[PDB]
Each structure stands twice: as C-alpha cells, then as structure tokens.
Design a protein around this nucleic acid. Structure first.
Ligand code: ZN
Ligand code: ZN
Lengths: 136, 322, 141
RNA sequence: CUCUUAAGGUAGCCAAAUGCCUCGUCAUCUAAUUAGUGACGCGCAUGAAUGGAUUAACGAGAUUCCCACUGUCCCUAUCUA
RNA sequence: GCAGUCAAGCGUUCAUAGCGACAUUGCUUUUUGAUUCUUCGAUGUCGGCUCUUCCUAUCAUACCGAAGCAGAAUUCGGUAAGCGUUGGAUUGUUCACCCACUAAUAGGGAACGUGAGCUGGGUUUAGACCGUCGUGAGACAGGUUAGUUUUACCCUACUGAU
C-alpha cells in the first residue's frame, strides 16, 4: 500500500477487477483506463486480483491523446459503484467506476478532477485531495 | 553538394587485385565525405545514402561502358530525384559525356503548370524532355518515338516499366517496391545500339531530410512506424473537401478552434474518420487504429490517385488546383 | 517568470517548464540502466552473429537488421519511445560498431526533453557451435 | 558457345489448405501474441482447363479482431418440478 | 542433472572473499540410449481442469556465520521443508518466451499421480484438399479441415449415520 500512500486504509469491497475499464476523471486527455494489475494484491490460484477505492493499479489507456496510450502507467481509483461500508455502518456507492493517472510516488499527472472523490482516497493521497473540488 | 565518386583510371593494365583495390579504397574514401557532411549539418539530419560495397562496385561496371546515360524521374516532385553532382561527375574521361537528364510520367500535370515549370529548366539553360512512358520551347509532350546506352533511375519511379513502351516485351521485373530490380541486365534491342540499366540507388539529397517529403517510394511504406509525419504531410495538402469527395467520409466541423489543430486538421482526426468508416479496430478495445489505416491512404497518395505537385522555386501558397 | 528552483538565478518561461536547462542537463539523467559498451559474437568462416539465445540472423555488415538485433539486445532502450537510431561509422579492422540513440524520457511532470547519447558495440570472434559440431562426425540422420 | 534425347517455370501468386530450416524477416494490431493482417521471396517441393489470378452474392464451411451481451470467469449462492 | 578431492591460473601485488583448468571418485531414476524380463482371449495412450499427500537438492519467510559486509544493498554459507510459491497474451502443447503484480513468483515424486473424475485442442481409423515421390494402386512420422469418449446397484477404502 505504501507506494507513497500516507496511512493504512481499512478494507473496501473489491469492486473492479482486471479487465475492467473505468472512466478517467482528470484533465490528462485520457478518457478511459483499462486495469491490468494491482499493487498490494494477494496471490491465490485462479483468483484474479481486484482493486478497491483508494487503491493503486497499473493501467493502460484505450481512448485519448495517442502520446499516452500503448503504454502502462500507474493509476489511482477515486470512485467505484460497488457498495462498500464505512465503519459508521452506512453503505454507499457511486454510479461510475473512475480513476486518475499518477506517477508511482503518488503525484498526479493532471491538474484537476471532475466529479466527486472518495474520502478513503483523499485522506490517503494528499495530492489527490489537492486537485479535488468535491469530496463526497 | 558532393554525391557520386569517380571512376579513376581503368587504364588497361593488369592486377585484378589492383583493379579491385583502387575502387574499394575509392568507396572507403567516397563515404568519408558522407560522414564529413553527416556531422556537418547539426547532428540529426541524414538522407538514405547506401553503403553497399557490392552495388557501389556494380555501378563501376555500367556507366562508363554505356557512355550515354539517361535519368528517370517522377513528374510529381522532380528536384530530389535529380542528382546534383551527377552532371559534374559524368565529365571525367574526356569523351562522349553529358548525361542530359530527363523526366518521366508527365501525364498528371496541367497545361498552365507544365510550361511555367519548363521555364525552370530552361531559365537555368539545362537539358530535359517530358515523356509519358506508361501510355527550344516548341513542344507540348512528345510521343514514344523521340554506341551503348545507360538507363539509371530512382527506385520504382517507373524505370522498370518505361521499357514496356519501347519494346513492350516484359523483359525486366517490376512491382511497387523500392528494392526489386537487381543484377544489372544489358537489354538488347535494335542491334546498332545496346541498352544497359543498373540496380537502383539512393543519392545525398541533404535538402529536406527529417521534415521533408521522401515518403513517395524511398522508405518502405509497407514497413513504416512513424505514421504521423508521413500522414500529417498529406493533411497539410489536399484540402478537406477532396478527402470528403473521394472516400465520402465526415471528418470534423472544426471543433478545436484554439491553437490545437484549427483549420486543416492533423493526422489524428481524419485517420479516425477512415478506420472507423472501414471498421479497422485494435485488439482489446474498439479504437480506430491509425498506423494500419495510414498504409491504406499512403499507397493511394504515391501511385497517383491523390495528387499534389511541387510549387515554384519560391514559397508559394496554392499552385495545384483540383 | 519563475526561478530555476535548483540553482535559482535562470528566469524561464511559463509555457510549462522546470528547473534550468543546465540544471536538468547536469543533475538529471534519463538514460540510466544501460551499458555503453556491448559485446556481441561473430563467426570467422560464415560471418554470422546472434543474440545470446536465438538463431543467427545471417545479416551482412552494415545491414538494416543490425538495428533489429541491436534493439532486441536486452537494454532499457525499449522502455522509452525510441527514435533516430541511425548508424555511426566505425573502422572495420578495429572491430568495433557504433550507434547513437535518442530516447524521450519524461522529465519531472509532462515536460518532454530530447536526449543525445551514444553507445559502442564491440564484437568477439566465435566459431559458430552449429557450424562446428556439424563438421564433427556423430550419428547421422 | 552450349550439355544431356526434347524444352528450360512465361504471365501471375506465396511461409498460401502447398515453405523443411521456421516461432523466417520487417511493420502493424496488443500491456504482453508460436496466432491474425499487409509486404519481401534462390519457392525443401507455387504455377497456368493434372487449370493460374481476381471475383459481387451465397455459406449450419475454416480462422482473427471489434461493439453489444451475459454466472464462461473472479466466486459462489438461492428457488421450482 | 547434481555433489566431493586435486585448482593451471583469473579475481587492484594479496592459489578458493568469489569464478574457473586438467582430470579423478561417485550419486539419484525426477533425462535419452539398451535390453526385451512382465501385459498381444482389454493395465484405455498427450496435455490441461480438479484434489490430496510426500521428498529437499531452500525461491521467499524465521534464526545464525563469513565476506574488496561503514551504513544501505548484495553474495556465499549452516540448520531448517513449519507456511506459502500467482494473474495473464501467443501456442493443443509438456517445454519455451513475454507483460504485470508479488515476500516469492524453487525443483521434483506418487503406474512419467489422476479419462466407471471431466475435457477431447493433439496424436491415432474410415471422408476430403495441397506439395513431393511413384507408370499406377497408393506412401509421407509433411501441412489443413471434419470426425460417437460407455457401466458402479458389488467388496474394500473414505466421508458421514444407526
Ligand atoms: Zn538551473
Ligand atoms: Zn560460420
């Protein structure tokens, strides 16, 4: 988790596995992100890994600004549609799985984030919180 | 500047070893200038100069024994196909010389272009002649009618099919690749003369090396990887209606009005109107693949279906008019 | 109107840029992870050469596929957007080969910078194991 | 000039359902492709009614890719006869 | 394939901190070769899915020792097999190569584990096409395509129940 992540995050329901295509929410010119693998993942036979809110993944771009795509890059999710649970008991879910491009240290690539962002990612990555207007 | 080396003193001696070495050294020291002019300009610019000892030795079998050499050039951009110092070179043995260059496949250029362009060669008092080979001023375009003979040319500018208007007997191999005809062939016809061609070559055209226009037949279009330069150049030419005319595609309403593309879009907004209209999509996600659709428009730009011509020696806005 | 933020004195443009050109030239490097000498192998009877595990490419000296084998040689050159891999001449008898490479490694944040660096490829003589054993006489087919 | 008694692969096409070497070489598709497509061709051993090449349409024909779609899968659960 | 003794000599001068001659003894059946000993009146023959257990010649983890081991990072080494040792592209594939995560992506066995457990892509019938051979029927361990996978209600074992 500590690929530049500040603290330790509680567990969140694994929404979007590999093969998933989530929107991009930054102004980097990318319009979607195809997840291929995950950081901090565990290894079990025939279990394909998965990514939850706040997690860092390896991603590819499938639409936008062809100087970006046909290469792997790190990304950070900021929204998912799978309902998880905060320790205050409430469940919640967005309407779209969405992420952000970043460098391996946690710094973003773009300058601002369209749409809302999870508290569970903003508290963990400060640069994300800096470039975000709406936190839930 | 310097292009072709000399053919020094065959001289009728002996020592096959010597006749080899005095040309092998010539090659080794011919290429020196290429390297001298390699770092001469910046440290990136570098045109397609072959370094093959075998073909550079074969060229020393043909021109002198021909003693009357003639050039072939595509009629779409005839400056780079021409050799600067070939005129300078074929003046060394003090005998019959003067290659007296010619141009070929002149059945694409219009009436009020061809005369003002013949003024180019005539104003510089040099020799030339137009020749439609597939099918001083008192001419238009002369027919098929008008001692050994050389026949040199750039790769696949039509040299391997020019002879199909002379004898029409299909004597030499030809396709649309820049590396077909090899192992020079002395084609016999009209026994009072003997005709010899050569394998193809590529000479030191320093003007326009990186940002140029040698995506005609010089590099293999069937094997390219840049796909934006070689495609974006066609975008700067061929106004937007003509690609809408032939293919029938809908490109763009000039969305990005800032300094991104503006008018005359680049090689990212029209190639995606072709492959998305041809269904050529990638492996993994529906995305209009550019580099394998740029090879279905570039084999149409060079064969002669999509036409653009050179402008006068000065910078001129719009010489062609479709 | 910014400062070079490494040395300080260079007031640069706001086209979108970083510390001073001298500061990125001297301190920052984006070509690490490669040896600048590369030892290849070559025969002295059939003039053949290969990658360490693979078939011998058969290419003659100064061929286009020299660049193919030379990029297939395991470096981090493939990682970063290769371009302008033209050949530099070297002496045939001094048995060395030279190429200049240029990769566009990203600077700090979306600032693309050229890079001009050089590598030398040296060759050692082998006798071609497949070419030999064959001259040796074991069981026939 | 020729050698075998005759002629000596023409137009065309190709790692093709024909290509051993072979996962041929180059480019492209992919994050990655022994696959697929395009091109090259001294082609183990292509080839002209033992028919060659191209072909719109058709095909419970073989093969590759994409959009949509989904318990095929992650990863199993529940209901009925 | 692995190990041990001699170790020319390479390893900033500093024969083993480490790598490597000449050889030499010798191990395992987890490799080919060789035998034809068991099966020719049925031992169902490739791989993969699944699942369990064992071995150690330890990839990681734990504890130690030595290093041209300051730290950091590595290498070598000793006990040690308790626990774990992946997701994917191409390929029928075992093998291989590549991408990516990971503490790690170690090697092997159980009738080359496992078809009344599955599948049937491959091989291995008959149909049919090409190339080469052959006068011809026909051959090719060469390529391609299509092509029926059976039975448990018995004994034991095992799981659970009287
Ligand atoms: Zn500075
Ligand atoms: Zn050899």
């Amino acid at each position: 988790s500590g690929n530049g992540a500040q603290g330790t995050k509680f567990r969140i329901s694994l929404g979007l596995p590999v093969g998933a295509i989530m929107n991009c929410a930054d102004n980097s010119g990318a319009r979607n992100l195809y997840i291929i693998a995950v950081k901090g993942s565990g290894s079990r036979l025939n279990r394909l890994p998965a990514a939850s809110l706040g997690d860092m993944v390896m991603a590819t771009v499938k639409k936008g600004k062809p100087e970006l795509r046909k290469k792997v890059m790190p990304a950070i999710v900021v929204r998912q549609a799978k309902s998880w649970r905060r320790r205050d008991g409430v469940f919640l879910y967005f309407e779209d799985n969405a992420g952000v491009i970043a460098n391996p240290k946690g710094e973003m690539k773009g300058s601002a984030i369209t749409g809302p962002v999870g508290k569970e990612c903003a508290d963990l990555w400060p640069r994300v919180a800096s470039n975000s207007g709406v936190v839930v | 500047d310097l292009i072709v080396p000399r053919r020094p003193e065959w001289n009728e001696g002996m020592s096959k070893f010597q006749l080899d070495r005095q040309e092998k050294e010539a090659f080794l020291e011919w290429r020196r200038k290429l390297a001298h002019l390699q770092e001469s300009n910046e440290d990136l610019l570098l045109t397609p100069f072959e370094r093959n000892i075998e073909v550079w030795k074969q060229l020393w079998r043909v021109v002198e024994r021909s003693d009357l050499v003639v050039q072939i050039v595509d009629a779409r951009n005839p400056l780079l196909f021409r050799s600067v110092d070939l005129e300078r070179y074929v003046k060394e043995s003090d005998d019959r010389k003067a290659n007296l260059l010619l141009v070929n496949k002149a059945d694409l250029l219009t009436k009020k272009q061809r005369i003002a362009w013949a003024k180019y060669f005539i104003s510089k008092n040099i020799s030339f002649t137009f020749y439609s080979a597939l099918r001083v001023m008192e001419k238009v375009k002369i027919l098929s009618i008008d001692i050994n003979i050389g026949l040199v040319g750039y790769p696949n500018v039509g040299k391997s099919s020019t002879i199909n208007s002379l004898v029409g007997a299909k004597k030499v191999s030809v396709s649309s690749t820049p590396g077909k005809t090899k192992h020079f062939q002395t084609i016999k016809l009209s026994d009072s003369v003997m005709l010899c061609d050569c394998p193809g070559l590529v000479f030191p055209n320093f003007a326009y090396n990186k940002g140029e226009l040698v995506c005609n037949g010089v590099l293999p279009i069937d094997q390219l990887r840049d796909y934006i330069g070689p495609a974006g150049l066609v975008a700067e030419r061929i106004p937007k209606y003509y690609i809408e005319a032939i293919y029938g595609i809908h490109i763009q309403t000039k969305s990005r009005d800032e300094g991104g593309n503006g008018d005359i879009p680049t090689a990212q907004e029209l190639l995606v109107a072709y492959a998305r209209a041809r269904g050529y999509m990638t492996q993994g996600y529906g995305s209009a693949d550019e580099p394998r659709a740029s090879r279905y428009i570039l084999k149409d730009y060079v064969n002669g279906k999509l036409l653009y011509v050179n402008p006068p020696p000065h910078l001129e806005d719009d010489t062609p008019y479709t | 109107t910014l400062l070079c933020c490494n040395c300080g004195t260079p007031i640069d443009g706001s086209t979108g840029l970083v510390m001073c050109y001298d500061c990125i030239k001297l301190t920052v490097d984006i070509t690490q992870g490669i040896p600048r000498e590369a030892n290849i192998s070559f025969c002295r009877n059939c003039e053949r050469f290969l990658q360490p595990p693979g078939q011998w490419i058969r290419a003659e000296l100064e061929s286009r596929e020299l660049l193919a084998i030379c990029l297939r040689r395991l470096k981090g050159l493939t990682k970063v957007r290769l371009v302008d891999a033209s050949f530099i001449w070297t002496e045939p008898h001094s048995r060395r080969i030279r190429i200049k490479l240029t990769v566009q490694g990203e600077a700090m944040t979306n600032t693309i910078i050229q890079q001009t660096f050089e590598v030398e490829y040296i060759v050692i003589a082998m006798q071609c194991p497949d070419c030999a054993r064959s001259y040796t006489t074991n069981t026939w087919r």
